[PDB]
Design a protein around this nucleic acid. Structure first.
Lengths: 128, 56, 23, 62, 102, 46, 95, 110
RNA sequence: GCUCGCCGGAAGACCAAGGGUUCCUGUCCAACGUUAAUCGGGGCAGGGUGAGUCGACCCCUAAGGCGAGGCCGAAAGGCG
């Protein structure tokens, strides 16, 4: 009840990779597909298996309390999963985004927050 | 009134001779928690003289 | 109407975060 | 083209011109809905139009 | 009237690649050419998720001034200089030394 | 207090506007001098 | 009117929340049209090209914003917006 | 082994920052960190930042044990200063100098 | 959110003039804001102004202006 953490993130990730709808979620989404590329959707299996396995390299303390993660721990994780530290930093970034988002879902309404979602365009020119 | 001659960096140094701050000497160490803090001021955890008198 | 609405709404919060990572 | 178009009468050219504007319209419709992949098409048609028009003129001109 | 063209095998006169031979990928307007296996640079690429581009140090091929590359004579095994004549009615290239067409 | 510039559009344009210049010999000489110095805008127009 | 002019009127569908709102609730579509076209010609052009029945066309002109790119001050171009009321027996096509 | 951390173009005058910089010169970085914590100044938090950064540098890059570090050289230089304008009475105006400074901290195990 | 305090023939509400996007949302905090700023009339992106009957246009003239011919004036031009 403290808030959103890597435990709930883990649950949502395993439920994700089990229920993964990339082909279906591409259909479920309409306004985002008109702007962003159609084939830009990443494969769920590889990415989410990588994420699950990398999370599995983490102790229970680094999960419930994600802000104690540092470089040496990233080394342990990367060496454990047999991958690059930049990927660990990548997944920590994605987890930061997810945490921020879910925090915004918890603070406001799901309808105000679902309608507050915006598609960023740096100009009216497409892809520029 | 306004000065007659440009005062040298020397004078400017002298005037500032008194402007140095005083580093606080003591950091009191609270008994229970052990964190350092000011004399007579509560800690970062709200500890004072062994109580936790703020829940925060 | 309400079916598809509620259905998609349940998982609605999980999708765009992964979609943003894909984009 | 432009040899190909040159051997057609004025009527068939008016008809082609209208087809072209329908195609062009349809195209920038698709392009403003974000439904276009091949952009190079616009230029293709936008220029062909001119070709046709430039003929109509000289068939009236002389 | 352009001397060095796509797909010519060339030899490199100048630079760290002096003496090396290779095949031309393309030419650029500024008088620069890009040659196979020639003038590798190590470039750092910020990973791009839209293009699924990983990060890392990519070895890439950097343009070389066309004055510095010579058209490679396969007959003589030497670098050559090129010239133009008219055979048939067509404008054609030849090697200056053995005066044979290309 | 009440300063010197109290703006008005209709005033501005009847006084200095393009047509107002073109009305006269002198005005067309202004527009000559400007075109010769190569200004971005000659007159005051919207 | 001539048809040749018509096909040159209608630039693009306008996409936004207001747009969607009217399209759903009041049965109305929103168009970016050539700056010079008029209510007559837009009525004509929709009725012709989408082949559906127009009731009335309301319009407005949008002044483009003013922008800065690399300190430079540019001006986005003007354009014309048209709220196009469909007689109710129609149901939308997007092509 | 000496280690640098710098912060360049900080808003504060060289002068104001010097006051604090001259508080921590020479101490081992623990004691100095605390000196800085309970100093009430702006410069204090600037310099705290730079010092902490400096510790990270030492440990992570050069493999120094934190206990041993002292602050050997800490100096605040002048930065590029920006002109502004404050309008003054009777119409005259004033070119204002918004000053910046270079805080440079250097720590060593020796 | 709660109390406190000020304006109320205004420190409220609506226009014309003048300005020209400052409007509304999201996002950011270098510079700008006489301090911080997570905030803004600041930055970047998006949205936003729907008329037979409200205005302008339009119909009619005031003072005044321009003014075919015309009168006048070295030239330009002045008067009508």
């Amino acid at each position: 009840g403290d808030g959103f953490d890597l435990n709930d993130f883990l649950e949502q990730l395993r439920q994700m990779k089990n229920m993964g709808g990339x082909x279906x979620x591409x259909x479920x989404x309409x306004x985002x597909x008109x702007x962003x590329x159609x084939x830009x959707x990443x494969x769920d299996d590889k990415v989410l298996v990588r994420m699950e396995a990398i999370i599995n390299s983490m102790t229970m303390k680094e999960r419930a309390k994600p802000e104690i993660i540092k470089g040496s721990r990233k080394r342990r994780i990367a060496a454990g999963c047999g991958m690059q530290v930049q990927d660990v930093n990548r997944l920590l970034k994605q987890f930061d985004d997810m945490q921020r988002m879910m925090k915004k879902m918890k603070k406001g309404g799901x309808x105000x927050x679902x309608x507050x979602x915006x598609x960023x365009x740096x100009x009216x020119x497409x892809x520029x | 009134a306004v000065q007659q001659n440009k005062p040298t960096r020397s004078k400017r140094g002298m005037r500032r001779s008194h402007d140095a701050l005083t580093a606080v000497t003591s950091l009191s160490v609270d008994k229970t928690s052990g964190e350092k803090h000011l004399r007579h001021h509560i800690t970062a955890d709200g500890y004072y003289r062994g109580r936790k008198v703020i829940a925060k | 109407k309400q079916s598809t609405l509620a259905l998609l709404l349940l998982l609605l919060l999980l999708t765009p975060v992964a979609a943003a990572a894909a984009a | 083209k432009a040899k190909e178009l040159r051997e057609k009468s004025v009527e068939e050219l008016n008809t082609e011109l209208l087809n072209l504007l329908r195609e062009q319209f349809n195209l920038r419709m698709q392009a403003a809905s974000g439904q276009l992949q091949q952009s190079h098409l616009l230029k293709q048609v936008r220029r062909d139009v001119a070709r046709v028009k430039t003929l109509l003129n000289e068939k009236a001109g002389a | 009237a352009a001397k060095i063209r796509r797909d010519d095998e060339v030899i490199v006169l100048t630079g760290k690649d002096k003496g090396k031979r290779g095949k031309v990928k393309n030419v650029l307007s500024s008088g620069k050419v890009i040659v196979e296996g020639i003038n590798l640079v190590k470039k750092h690429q910020k990973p791009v998720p839209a293009l699924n581009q990983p990060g890392g140090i990519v070895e890439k091929e950097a343009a070389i001034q066309v004055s510095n590359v010579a058209i490679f004579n396969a007959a003589t095994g030497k670098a050559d200089r090129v010239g133009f004549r008219f055979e048939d009615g067509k404008k054609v290239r030849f090697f200056k030394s053995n005066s044979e067409t290309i | 207090m009440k300063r010197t510039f109290q703006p008005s559009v209709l005033k501005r344009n009847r006084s200095h506007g393009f047509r107002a210049r073109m009305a006269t010999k002198n005005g067309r000489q202004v527009l000559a001098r400007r075109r010769a110095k190569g200004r971005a805008r000659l007159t005051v127009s919207k | 009117i001539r048809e040749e002019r018509l096909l040159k009127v209608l630039r693009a569908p306008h996409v936004s929340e207001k747009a969607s709102t009217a399209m759903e609730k009041s049965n109305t579509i929103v168009l970016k049209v050539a700056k010079d076209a008029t209510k007559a010609e837009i009525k004509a052009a929709v009725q012709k090209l989408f082949e559906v029945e127009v009731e009335v066309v309301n319009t407005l002109v949008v002044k483009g914003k003013v922008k800065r790119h690399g300190q430079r001050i540019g001006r986005r171009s003007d354009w014309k917006k048209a709220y196009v009321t469909l007689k109710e027996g129609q149901n939308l096509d997007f092509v | 082994m000496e280690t640098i951390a710098k912060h360049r173009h900080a808003r504060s005058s060289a002068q104001k920052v010097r006051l604090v910089a001259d508080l921590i010169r020479g101490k081992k970085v623990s004691q100095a960190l605390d000196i800085l914590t309970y100093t009430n100044k702006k410069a204090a938090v600037l310099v705290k930042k730079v010092l902490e950064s400096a510790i990270a540098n030492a440990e992570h890059n050069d493999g120094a044990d934190i206990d041993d570090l002292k602050v050997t050289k800490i100096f605040v230089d002048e930065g590029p200063s920006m002109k502004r304008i404050m309008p003054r009475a009777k119409g005259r105006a004033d070119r204002i100098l918004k000053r910046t400074s270079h805080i440079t901290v250097v720590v060593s195990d020796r």
